[PDB]
Structure 1
Amino acid sequence: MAKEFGIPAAVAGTVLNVVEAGGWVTTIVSILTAVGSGGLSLLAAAGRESIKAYLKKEIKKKGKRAVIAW
């Protein structure tokens, strides 16, 4: 999230926690949208999936820590 998108670690951890805790998509969307363009880029990257759905998959494959780094 940092390397690819430039999402600060404190914002990214929050986002992933919300994902892992089955939080509202709209929550994830406001946090990510507030980060500015790096967050907009990560929103764009999901495509037509929900961001929650997308990031869930991403943690499933690389684990929390690597998703924060990415």
Structure 2
Amino acid sequence: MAKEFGIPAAVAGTVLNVVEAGGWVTTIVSILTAVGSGGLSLLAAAGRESIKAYLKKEIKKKGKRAVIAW
């Protein structure tokens, strides 16, 4: 999230913590839209898939730490 979307670690970690805690899609969308272009780009990358499901799958694929870095 950091290297490929320019989302800072503190925001990225917050978002992934919400994902892992089973938080609401609305919360994730609000944080990502508020961080600006990087968050908008990440939402775009998810396509039509729920941003929650998309990040869940990225965490499964790469591990949480690597998703933050990404």
TM-score, scaled relative to structure 2: 0.99
1:13 to partner: Cα distance: 0.2
1:3 to partner: Cα distance: 0.5
- Distance in 2, matches of 1:32 and 1:2, equals 13
- Distance in 2, matches of 1:57 and 1:36, equals 23
- What RMSD over aligned residues (CA atoms) do the two structures have, in Å? 0.3
1:60 to partner: Cα distance: 0.3
Query: C-alpha deviations, 1:21-48, integer Å up to 9, x for none?
Result: 1100000000000000000000000000
Aligned length: 70
- Distance in 2, matches of 1:7 and 1:38, equals 6
Identify the residue that residue 8 of structure 1 maps to in structure 2.
Answer: 8
Runs of at least 4 residues off by over 4 Å: none
1:61 to partner: Cα distance: 0.6
Gaps of 5+ in 2: none
TM-score, scaled relative to structure 1: 0.99
